Amino acid sequence: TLPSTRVPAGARHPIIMLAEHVADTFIAMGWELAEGPEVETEQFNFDALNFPADHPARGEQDTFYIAPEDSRQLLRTHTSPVQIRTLLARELPVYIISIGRTFRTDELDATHTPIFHQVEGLAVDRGLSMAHLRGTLDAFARAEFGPSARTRIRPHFFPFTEPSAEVDVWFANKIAWVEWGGCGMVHPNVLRATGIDPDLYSGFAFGMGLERTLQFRNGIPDMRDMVEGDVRFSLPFGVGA
Amino acid sequence: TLPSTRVPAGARHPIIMLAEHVADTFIAMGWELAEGPEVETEQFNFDAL
Amino acid sequence: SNAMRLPYSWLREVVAVGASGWDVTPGELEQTLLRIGHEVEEVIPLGPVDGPVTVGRVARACAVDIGDRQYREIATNFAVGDLVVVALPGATLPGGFTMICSAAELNLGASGILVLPPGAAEPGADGAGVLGLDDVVFHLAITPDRGYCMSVRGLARELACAYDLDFVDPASNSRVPPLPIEGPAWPLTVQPETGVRRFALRPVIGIDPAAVSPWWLQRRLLLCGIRATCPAVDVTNYVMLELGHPMHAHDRNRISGTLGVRFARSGETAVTLDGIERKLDTADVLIVDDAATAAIGGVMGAASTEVRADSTDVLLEAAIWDPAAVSRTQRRLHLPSEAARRYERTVDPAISVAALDRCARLLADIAGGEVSPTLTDWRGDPPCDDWSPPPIRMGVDVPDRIAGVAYPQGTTARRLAQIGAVVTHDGDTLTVTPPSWRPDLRQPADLVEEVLRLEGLEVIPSVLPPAPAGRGLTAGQQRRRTIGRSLALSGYVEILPTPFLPAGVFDLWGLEADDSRRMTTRVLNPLEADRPQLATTLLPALLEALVRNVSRGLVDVALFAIAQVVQPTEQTRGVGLIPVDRRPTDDEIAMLDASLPRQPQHVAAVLAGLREPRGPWGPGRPVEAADAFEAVRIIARASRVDVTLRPAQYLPWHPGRCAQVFVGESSVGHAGQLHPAVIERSGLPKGTCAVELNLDAIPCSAPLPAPRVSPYPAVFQDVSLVVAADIPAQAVADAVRAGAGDLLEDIALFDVFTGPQIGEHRKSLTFALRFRAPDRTLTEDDASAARDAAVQSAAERVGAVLRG
Amino acid sequence: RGLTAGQQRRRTIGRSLALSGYVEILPTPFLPAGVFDLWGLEADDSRRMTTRVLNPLEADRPQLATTLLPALLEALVRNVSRGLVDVALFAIAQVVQPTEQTRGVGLIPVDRRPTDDEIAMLDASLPRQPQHVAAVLAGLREPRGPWGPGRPVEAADAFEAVRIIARASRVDVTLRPAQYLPWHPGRCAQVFVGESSVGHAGQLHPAVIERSGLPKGTCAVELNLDAIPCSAPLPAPRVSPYPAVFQDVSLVVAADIPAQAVADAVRAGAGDLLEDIALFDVFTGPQIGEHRKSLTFALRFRAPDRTLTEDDASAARDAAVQSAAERVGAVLRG
RNA sequence: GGCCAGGUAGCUCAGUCGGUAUGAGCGUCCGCCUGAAAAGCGGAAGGUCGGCGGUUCGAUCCCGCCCCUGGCC
Ligand SMILES: CCOC(=O)[C@@H](C)N1C(=O)COc2ccccc21
Ligand SMILES: [Mg+2]
Ligand code: NA
Ligand code: NA
């Protein structure tokens, strides 16, 4: 029974491991993974996503902008510009997931972080409907919350989707419904901004935060432990693979 | 440039790695992987086929 | 702000006009609002109170008529004779407080005590009944596409849609009788380039300055978050809340000359109604006359024409301003007023006169005024008489296809009429003209959302689409996984690195002024003003996380990270807006990409303390430079490439313990021990080592080995070679391998020896060699000939001398 | 749905062993002739109850493998006999363990689907075929280099292989002294998950090594993956911002007491303030007494909501000392 | 945006409206001690008291500006 581990194992980060599990879930459904720059142009982060010119998110309040003023260059507020780039580079149909670092202005406390990671999905094909969106969301939910997981959608608003909706998740392992993310059908202005005929192709999209998903699933009290890099937060999750 | 690897890395078998690549190829298209016993009944090995 | 507050009693009242007897639980109404797309923030009841909470009349401390010829006795803003609410001894106020109460103490609103207007209630009536504490206030967050829902009119219409009720529009002319139009009310001129769509005026003459608004009006203003003031101002705020058209009252006697809508001038100021001086911009809209400025168009009125406690003649204003101009103006001077918030979300231009007439008649009723039969109604040049948007064509089954649900026949046409559109049929194509209060309905997708949200999203089935024939993970994505798995299994712990560099980190590193790592991208609005620079290297974030662990008792640490860096090649340059009505060309895309700083993906690691822990086997082993070199080899094996290490000088590394890493002939990064000065100036632990490689510079590989296993025995031999101390041991191994030829199966260094037997600044290296032929057994001479060729190769390439 | 949890676990186990220096082989299902006689197994040892092939390619090798170790040991001998004397091999495959004499099932008509009862009958007529993972080691475990002469394989390297497999499976195991051929009875651990036995590890019996022509000191491990349940933990760590207290404790016990039993007793008595415990010294000097040993553990105490005093930590240490006295007879070193 | 209240050792926090923070608990170092440890006992190291300036022979404490947390908005 003497200890024998001369080189004790490390740990991949739980957010990276969750991102890997999410990617594997969508690969198994035929989707692929795309990536893009974190410092992004305003064209792909806002303009191509049907954001109005005087939108409050384009101000200095919520978005990290690159100096000097009016540079039209910023840290991306979502991974949506990665899907715009894919829509421009790839032929149809497109089924792509984008998992990357995202930057918001919220301060760092027990339930918010300015630097977070989110997963975004984008599917554009002939005849895609809201039923296909909901089927994909439920499959995503079961893979991450268990066999008894189910989603619920309620109408909302986002500039790049119409109709738009917020997603709630029901997981029967709570320590009820929890707000998970947003979704909707790809706005036809987004398709026209990428050279796609909205009369021939329809599409859907969704987006969830990884740190948020990890917090209420595992019941992690302080999200500052997720980002500060203390060894005591990562090692309990095991080496990971 | 002095050698620094005190624990020389091993190797997974190339046949196992090929099977893994083949499996990933089909999983990426929506297929799934199933398994069964090597000692089998004649009903399932011959008669059913 | 997207906030909208109203009491349920008022909302139920408007809905009950067309649907008599309508009444639902506040929980049911909350679920209905959520189901059709209105986010409720809070459902707060009023009070509650019980026992002795009654209304009394005042006649410091004074006697209060509690009713029935009984007088109880127990500051600031109340005189003698005002009706007040008293808390008799034994009363229980929210929550647990067991006295002239205020609106805040009764949980009803926001300084002074509550003063009921004369005639609101008889002294002695039930307090909870007069205040209406059974009511419930709904706090909603309205999305920016539904400006029509910033009012009781819009939310009541939405409920009538969701419950399939008959709806009576409170802004209609059958509900707001048309006052006479016998001539102009006031001369005005409008510059059409300012975005005004409609401007209406109607005066009210001879109102009682001592009159006060009735209690039902004041109570509804309080529950909506607006403090009552005087009848002239209360009716303008009340009609804004009721119909969604903001209204403003000007003192008619303090208007000098023709009113004018005009763009402001640079440096021009305007004293607003709050008594604060505002600096104006050239892109702002103003109402002015022959003397001063009357209002900031769509934001707030000025103190020049402000209604005061003695005003008797009121000119009422009903105008439609440009939404972009109002938003651009109110955000510059930080005035998110109730009018500005509604104008920036667009206001229904068809109800301007209807809201004006409603306002004038209500003011005269409660203040005893006289409504003048004059009216000015500017509706553009040429005058606009039809405010309907362009029609929209879409197939009758388009909402069915998008939803994936076969709705009953007529569903789409019924729902689009329910929300106010004109719907005509032409075969299988509907021509839909949205109502004037729905400028968000512009194309079929907008119409689809209306049908789907009203039918309910819960009827959309969960249907997984078929799996496309995907290719899976790319070679680069797989490699990042293998690298992460390999470092973690070797004892490294992954962190998420922050992109904002610590203040003066490169000064702590002692880098030169022209070091490329200093050329950073700056953020304009960072959370920390002294950390605006984005990271050109992952090591500062890793070393920061290393300090955190060591400072908290975890002194034996090995951390790694995989993330992009930000390395600009020019000053921050943006590209102009590309039209969104088309696809950008490949030239415009390449121009967009070229304007962005280089963002390659790096892998990096830091180590400090014990590399191997102590235990029953021994005392463990402190981190050394070779551990950083081994991390490079772990990353290399994971990437399936060969690397070479060469001595180098590159801060922040120790110049005598730093390797530059090469793949082929390309430099991919550095590794080794950190400079002791950098460690001292950074508060790092002594002996800290670090690695950073550029993954994008490492090429992906797909080797196809075909080994052939020889069944013949091997020959073992060792060779000792003396070289100058500066000769890398790998260079000797390479020279031995090139000389030995194909018989050499394995070579491994197992001895490095210095001493006087060898000579100053020289060293002896002994390698274990394994020779094997593929087709025969070797003789010792066969192996020695290969060994002798290896020795001669080493003499030629690194100056080796056979050990003697 | 992608890979199952078991298919995923098999990949992770194989990656971890390979990265730890093990070389995977493909094991043959046919047992070498008389291998169980070389091992000295009893006539009633369950591993001798084998399924036999009627027409094998080698008439002396008809039986199918109930254990992966014979095929691994045969590959180890092939490597060592050809000049590769420092080797560590592993394999993941199924074994064949019948529970009765070979019994067939008559032909089911193929014009229809077999009923679920007929399917369960066909399954019950087959021998049990669970998945195993196994490994063998000999020679140098760590090679010589400019650091020193390297380190020969010892039983602790087989125990570490168990912990590599356990960490890869995300399960906790315990190791208990056992006697079980072909292992060395004084250097053999039985491996448990909870209270269920999942295999064995350690050094092989010297007599088995002699009779089988194996390298001296050969070590081995074999675990039944089917007996290791697939786990899906969801940790919720709470990082305490308060400082820790460091103390060491030295306890004297009888030599037969396992070190893990002492650590377990120390942990049970110390309570929730104990954040970490690590053994760093085992002393059997002359001041200790015959058949006894002194063990010294490094202890890390940390409170989740306050800074501790030395007395607070010493109180938890003293309760750990009393726990060890009661459970393993430990005496505080003095 | 207001007058305030906070930033102090490696960690968590006290305390002083000018010449020593005789700072605490834990963390770090040395000795007695032990085969080596720890506790215990006895010795020590370490802060430029939020930054840039102003006053003063001398400023953690008094003036001005700014950085970041909160309370109330
Ligand atoms: C993490 C919270 O952000 C979101 O969920 C929202 C704002 N969102 C994105 O950020 C990008 O992807 C989306 C796709 C469809 C609807 C909404 C989104
Ligand atoms: Mg809409
Ligand atoms: Na070295
Ligand atoms: Na030389």
Numbering used by the authors:
A (entry chain D): 98 to 272, 276 to 341
B (entry chain A): 98 to 146
C (entry chain E): -2 to 56, 69 to 83, 87 to 110, 124 to 135, 138 to 831
D (entry chain B): 498 to 831
Task: Recite the paper's sentences.
The protein-fragment interactions were analyzed using crystal structures for five of those fragments complexed with MtPheRS/tRNAPhe (DDD00107555 (D-555), DDD01008876 (D-876), DDD00805735 (D-735), DDD00079004 (D-004) and DDD00067116 (D-116)). All five fragments occupy the L-Phe site in the α subunit of the heterotetramer. The fragments’ orientation in these structures is very similar to the L-Phe substrate, however there are subtle differences in orientation and details of interactions. PIEDA showed that the phenyl ring or the bicyclic core of the fragments interact with residues αPhe255 and αPhe257 through hydrophobic interaction. One of two carbonyl groups of the D-555 interacts with αGln215 and αGly282 through hydrogen bonds. The core and the carbonyl oxygen of the oxazinone moiety interacts with αSer177 and αArg201 through hydrogen bonds, respectively. Fragment D-555 is unique in forming key interactions with αSer117, αPhe213 and αGly282 residues. However, the auxiliary pocket in the structures of PheRS with bound fragments was completely unoccupied offering an opportunity for fragment growth by adding hydrophobic substituents to explore the auxiliary pocket of MtPheRS.
